[PDB]
Design a protein around this motif. Structure first.
Motif, PDB file in Angstrom:
ATOM      1  N   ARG A 216       2.817   4.676  -1.764  1.00 18.48           N
ATOM      2  CA  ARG A 216       2.601   5.778  -2.719  1.00 18.48           C
ATOM      3  C   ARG A 216       3.677   6.870  -2.545  1.00 18.48           C
TER       4      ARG A 216
ATOM      5  N   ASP B 288       0.838  -1.217   0.000  1.00 13.21           N
ATOM      6  CA  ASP B 288       0.000   0.000   0.000  1.00 13.21           C
ATOM      7  C   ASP B 288       0.880   1.277   0.000  1.00 13.21           C
TER       8      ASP B 288
ATOM      9  N   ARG C  98       4.496  12.255  -2.034  1.00 11.27           N
ATOM     10  CA  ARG C  98       3.210  12.046  -2.723  1.00 11.27           C
ATOM     11  C   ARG C  98       2.816  13.181  -3.683  1.00 11.27           C
TER      12      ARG C  98
END
Ligand SMILES: [Mg+2]
Ligand SMILES: [Mg+2]
Ligand SMILES: [Mg+2]
Ligand SMILES: [Mg+2]
Ligand SMILES: [Mg+2]
Lengths: 104, 84, 136, 177
Positions: free
Chosen positions: D113, D111, D176
């Motif tokens: 990013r 998970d 991000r």
RNA sequence: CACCCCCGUGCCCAUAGCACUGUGGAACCACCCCACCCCAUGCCGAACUGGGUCGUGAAACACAGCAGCGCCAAUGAUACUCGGACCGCAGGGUCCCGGAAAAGUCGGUCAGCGCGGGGGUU
RNA sequence: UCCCAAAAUGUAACGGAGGCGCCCAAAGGUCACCUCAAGACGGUUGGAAAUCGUCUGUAGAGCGCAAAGGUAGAAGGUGGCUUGACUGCGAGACUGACACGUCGAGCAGGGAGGAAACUCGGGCUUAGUGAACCGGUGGUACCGUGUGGAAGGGCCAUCG
């Protein structure tokens, strides 16, 4: 910290002992090993390292101590009180002690 | 026997004998041993020829004359300026 | 009225007003000319008198507060100890001390509300105005 | 094993990005602090050795148990009981664990990013947040006790967050977008 | 105490302190540099500690500016008060004589004074 | 212990508040080292506080307890080594009507820590106690009823 100098400097009971104090500046490589008088705001003997280090900088150990011990007799001084600034009495400063402890 | 209490609450007897303070002052002659201050903590701290007992008592080490140095509270000192 | 947290009991002594200006907060004030002990109920009595007279708005400054605890005699005796925690709270007022001050009301409106509040007080009072700017 | 790759690529680039008077006025990385604030709900003598032994394999350092501040509050709070596990990394050992992160730690996260870029420690510092334990190069479920995580702090010689933000990313760090 | 500066160490420990701002590098001092040992970290050469330069003067320090804040602080006046003498039923108040604040205001300050050693006036 | 208590000491009330009748083999000795409460901003179980990080920070924390004084140049916090929580003594003071109680430099024998100057005869201090009488126990060899022993006593120590 700066608390260590003031610590040993306070435990150096000035006039009660009768003796004179021996200061050291081994934080850098120009050790100042001074003989300072208690009462009078005076410095009597002293032996540096800047004035010809003898190649060595940390190994100059006994050299500055020997210089001092000899300079002490030249004035008469026999009774002393060593003050390890913040320096944990082991190498550089432990030699300077024996160098003076055997030179008078 | 009752279900109330042992000792009765809301009292006002109780207090204690107690002494303290300065014994010898600025300009007094002292013999060695002479107590010059009785105190709690270190109101006055020791100086030249002035000792400090277990209970912070300030006494003369050697005979002479009592001298007080007041640097500004906390930094208070009693000393002996030897007569000879 | 009473205080929220404390000690329980006190004492007694007097001498001329220590901390009471003239014109702070309000435009007109009410000053003591005599020393006294202002009961919580006498202040409350004065407040309601003024509040009623100045129907809506709310511009009454009560510069005095009852903080001193006073005691009492249960019914008889003396063959016991110190007494009566819960008798009444008091404000030690000395001459000069501004007790009350009003705002947003006329000289005439204020003259009266103070004339009324005076009749409820255990001391002689004087009505005042501005020109006191000491320390700010 | 990364030292010159901090210098040659990051060090000149920051004077070629900004413009410092000296090579010393350029921001640097002071230290990396790894903290394991376990306990409270995990008051076990068995759990003490658990994370401590696991931390000894990743940092190559013996961890210290930071005892409670003798806070005996309303809830489950008491004397100086074991409540957190600490290990400090600076110089040689710092870059060993920092490289291990950008290469195996950071990319090999389920998970993933990127990390939070927003104004962190206002006086030029970073405090990374990890939410799992099964996302490390030397940590697997085969030789463990249960499931947990950890927390990591990055101390830098940066004067401002502006100068701090650049140093972290140019060293290799996800943001991000 | 010819004079400038620096490293140590005093008396004095806010009129010496902080903030903001500027100068100083290869004399001195600082980081820095590496560490297997001497020695050291209830973990980590962070600190102690050892060997040493270079590189820089960033950070630290030293020095200089400045009255924004701290600190210091009058004169006057009052409070209070030793002694003398009174008022009020009282809470409480007054007069004469010396003593004398605190807070505030004017203002004053980015100290002063030693001892030793090192380096400069190309 | 604080307040009353009138800036020395002392000072009463069936005046206002509150503790003590123990504890610590280290919470003692000494030599080393360390420095607190709180708040802002940033982050794993979390998220009002916690364990981490930087920035402010005479101290707003701590000191086994009550409060007062005191204290970071430590009396706070951590470790190495230890048994001075010694025997024989006390120049000289404090304090009390006494009897008590307090402090104590210095001397001897022996030690403990430290390279060393030095420090050490319990604990930061101020509460944690009980005369005398009769007696339990270890030591000692003073007295011991004609003599020599012994019983019993005395004396140091210490327990009730
Ligand atoms: Mg002032
Ligand atoms: Mg007179
Ligand atoms: Mg009079
Ligand atoms: Mg009369
Ligand atoms: Mg007068």
């Amino acid at each position: 910290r700066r608390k260590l100098r003031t610590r040993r400097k306070v435990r150096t009971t000035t006039a009660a002992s009768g003796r004179l104090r021996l200061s050291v500046y081994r934080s850098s490589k120009h050790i100042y090993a001074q003989i300072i008088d208690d009462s009078r705001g005076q410095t009597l003997a002293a032996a540096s390292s800047a004035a010809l280090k003898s190649g060595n900088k940390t190994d100059t150990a006994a050299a500055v101590g020997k210089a001092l011990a000899a300079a002490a007799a030249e004035k008469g001084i026999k009774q002393v009180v060593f003050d390890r600034g913040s320096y944990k009495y082991h190498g550089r400063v432990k030699a300077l002690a024996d160098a003076a402890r055997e030179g008078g | 026997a009752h279900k109330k209490g042992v000792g009765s609450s809301k009292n006002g007897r109780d207090s204690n004998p107690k002494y303290l303070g300065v014994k010898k002052f600025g300009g007094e002659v002292v013999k060695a041993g002479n107590i010059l201050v009785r105190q709690r903590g270190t109101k006055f701290k020791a100086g030249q020829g002035v000792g400090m007992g277990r209970d912070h008592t300030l006494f003369a080490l050697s005979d002479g004359k009592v001298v007080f140095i007041n640097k500004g509270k906390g930094a208070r000192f009693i000393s002996i300026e030897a007569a000879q | 009225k009473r205080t929220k947290f404390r000690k329980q009991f006190r004492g007694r002594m007097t001498g001329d007003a220590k901390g009471g200006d003239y014109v702070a907060f309000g435009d007109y004030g009410l000053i003591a000319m005599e020393p006294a002990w202002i009961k919580s109920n006498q202040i409350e009595a004065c407040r309601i008198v003024m509040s009623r007279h100045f129907r809506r708005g709310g511009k009454i400054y009560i510069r005095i507060f009852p903080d001193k605890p006073v005691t009492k005699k249960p019914a008889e005796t003396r063959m016991g100890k110190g007494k009566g925690a819960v008798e009444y709270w008091v404000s030690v007022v000395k001459p000069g001390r501004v007790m009350f001050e009003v705002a947003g009301v006329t000289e005439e409106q204020a003259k009266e509300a103070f004339r009324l509040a005076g009749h409820k007080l255990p001391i002689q009072t004087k009505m005042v105005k501005r020109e006191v700017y000491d320390e700010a | 094993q990364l030292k010159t790759k901090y210098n040659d690529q990051v060090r000149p680039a920051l004077m070629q990005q900004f413009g410092y008077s000296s090579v010393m006025a350029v921001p640097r990385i002071e230290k990396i602090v790894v903290n394991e604030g376990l306990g409270s709900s995990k008051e076990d003598s068995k759990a003490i050795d658990k994370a401590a032994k696991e931390l000894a394999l990743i940092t190559l350092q013996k961890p210290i148990i930071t005892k409670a501040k003798k806070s005996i509050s309303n809830f489950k709070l008491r004397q100086g009981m074991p409540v957190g596990i600490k290990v400090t990394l600076r110089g040689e050992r710092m870059y060993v664990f920092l490289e291990k992160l950008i290469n195996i730690g950071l990319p090999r996260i389920r998970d993933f990013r990127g990390i939070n870029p927003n104004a962190f420690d206002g006086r030029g510092n970073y405090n990374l947040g990890i939410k799992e334990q099964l996302i490390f190069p030397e940590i697997t479920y085969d030789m463990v006790d249960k499931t947990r995580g950890m927390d990591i702090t990055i101390v830098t010689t940066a004067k401002t967050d502006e100068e701090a933000r650049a140093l972290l990313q140019s060293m290799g760090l996800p943001f991000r977008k």
